């Protein structure tokens, strides 16, 4: 009875979570490729900062979305409206993807003053539609991410704690499985079959999630708003210019580590976007066995390799590291693990810098033409298997740094402020993505300039991206050294 009922409820919640994670990892994977493939093809780092700002907007709206949810509006209704806007955006995107609807919705180049000879005119034309789609999708997924975890949490919590542990083990497993399946199938479809259907499958996915969450609401267990103590912390902060001491301790303990982690999430999302771009400009193998115009090995498949290594490591990582690191001459602490993760990501960024330098030195001699997607990409004879080292380093650093940061944040904060520190974590991750996009904008602009070439759409093979990678690596190393120095005086 109760078993079956709560099981159906949490299974519906799990299906919605899997489908939303699937749609997210699907759209975010090949966004850079399609942003330069479609006739509104942007200019390289332009699409890179577009994806960076998308991720930053998601992670910035997450805390504000949770506040708005636990605010006047109802949590379940909040998730409903979030999924509605998410479906709106994931339906708007295939309209951009389909030629007829592309021409229809965006607008002809003769009306929006797009008569300038060059591909930049179509970009000026179709920029607002894509940006609106991106902002809608970002707000939707932000609210969904902020809301879905506490939702199933209270859905299961009523009975017992072991039920919550089992349900959230299932939650982690479903999230990772959805990530893997989405990456694989959706990226393969997008890159090797059709961008149209490649985006349309996320659409029907979001539709299924929305309808199952709507029909679940009838048999769900709703929860009235509690008060969203973010308003309390905001009131305290603006008036300063028993919750007082807890608030001040929580903030003073949380803000420094997350400030140090801001450049880390910067370089993480930069990993994502610019390594997708670099693999597009690196050498891609051929699956042309039964295929004409060979199916390309996806950078999203490389990200799947990363994530499946995360999956294989994390439990084994615990099981082997903990008992041995207990009796070790290299004893680990939360801050020391964050420092180790920062050093690993610095090494990965250095490796990426050397890889880009070698790629430039090689393309300076000769050039090949591998048609990834629907547009050609000039590349050099250097397989992308050299990105696997830096991807592995970034993955192990992900594990170390993020898990240590969350452990320290939770162990150094009261119980009630757990949602507040989670919101602040996602907020600082969004801040990191925004800082990354800003740094890219700064290195790209002609004011001082390191890689402009007046053409960044497909001619990045002459641009100096390795200088920007080394600048990011140097910033990360400076933050790591500062964290080391603060670790001494504390």
């Amino acid at each position: 009875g109760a078993f079956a009922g709560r099981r159906a409820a949490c299974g519906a919640v799990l299906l919605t979570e899997l489908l939303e994670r699937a749609a997210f990892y699907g759209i975010t994977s090949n966004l850079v490729l399609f942003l330069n493939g479609a006739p509104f093809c942007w200019e390289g780092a332009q699409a890179s900062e577009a994806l960076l700002l998308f991720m930053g907007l998601t992670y910035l709206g997450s805390p504000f979305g949770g506040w708005l949810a636990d605010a006047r509006l109802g949590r379940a209704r909040a998730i409903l409206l979030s999924l509605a806007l998410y479906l709106l955006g994931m339906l708007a995107f295939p309209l951009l993807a389909a030629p007829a609807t592309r021409a229809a919705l965006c607008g002809s180049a003769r009306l929006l003053n797009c008569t300038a000879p060059g591909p930049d005119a179509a970009a000026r034309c179709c920029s607002p539609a894509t940006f609106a789609g991106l902002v809608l999708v970002g707000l939707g997924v932000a609210t969904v991410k902020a809301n879905i975890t506490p939702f199933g949490a209270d859905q299961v919590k009523d009975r017992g704690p072991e039920a919550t542990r089992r349900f959230f083990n299932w939650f982690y497993w479903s999230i990772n499985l959805g990530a893997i399946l989405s990456l694989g199938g959706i990226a393969y479809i997008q890159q090797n079959v059709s961008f149209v259907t490649g985006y349309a499958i996320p659409t029907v996915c979001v539709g299924l999630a929305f309808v199952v969450f709507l029909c679940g609401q009838s048999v769900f267990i709703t929860k009235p708003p509690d008060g969203s103590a973010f308003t309390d912390m905001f009131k305290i902060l603006t008036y300063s210019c028993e919750e007082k001491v807890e608030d001040v301790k929580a903030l003073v303990k949380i803000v420094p580590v997350f400030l140090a982690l801001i450049p880390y999430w910067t370089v993480y999302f930069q990993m994502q976007t610019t390594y997708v771009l670099q693999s597009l400009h690196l050498r891609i193998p051929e699956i042309s066995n039964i295929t004409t115009t060979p199916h390309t090995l996806p950078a999203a498949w490389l990200t799947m390799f990363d994530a499946v290594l995360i999956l294989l490591l994390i439990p084994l990582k615990d099981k082997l590291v903990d008992p041995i690191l207990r009796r070790h001459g290299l004893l680990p602490s939360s801050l020391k693990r964050i420092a180790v993760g920062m050093f690993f990501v610095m090494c990965s960024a250095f490796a990426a810098g050397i890889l880009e330098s070698k790629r430039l030195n090689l393309v300076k001699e000769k050039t090949i033409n591998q048609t990834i997607g629907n547009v050609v990409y000039h590349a050099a004879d250097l397989s992308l298997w050299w990105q696997v080292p830096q991807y592995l380093l970034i993955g192990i650093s992900e594990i170390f740094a993020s898990i240590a940061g969350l452990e320290f944040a939770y162990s150094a904060a009261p119980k009630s402020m757990q949602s507040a520190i989670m919101g602040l974590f996602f907020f600082f991750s969004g801040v990191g993505s925004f800082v990354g996009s800003g740094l890219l904008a700064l290195v790209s602009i002609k004011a001082i300039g390191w890689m402009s070439s007046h053409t960044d759409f497909g001619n990045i093979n002459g641009c100096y991206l390795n200088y920007y990678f080394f600048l990011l690596a140097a910033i990360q190393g400076a933050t790591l050294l500062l964290f080391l120095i603060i670790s001494v005086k504390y």
Binding site: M55, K145, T149, A153, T164, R165, F168, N169, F171, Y172, W173, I175, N176, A179, Y268, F269, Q272, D306, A307, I310, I314, E398, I399, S402, I403, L406, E407, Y410, Q418, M422, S429
Partner: peptide, 14 residues
């Protein structure tokens, strides 16, 4: 990002 898993997790394992 990819570990939102173990992160909600810390939360409740807690």
């Amino acid at each position: 990002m990819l570990s939102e898993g173990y992160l909600s997790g810390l939360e409740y394992w807690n």
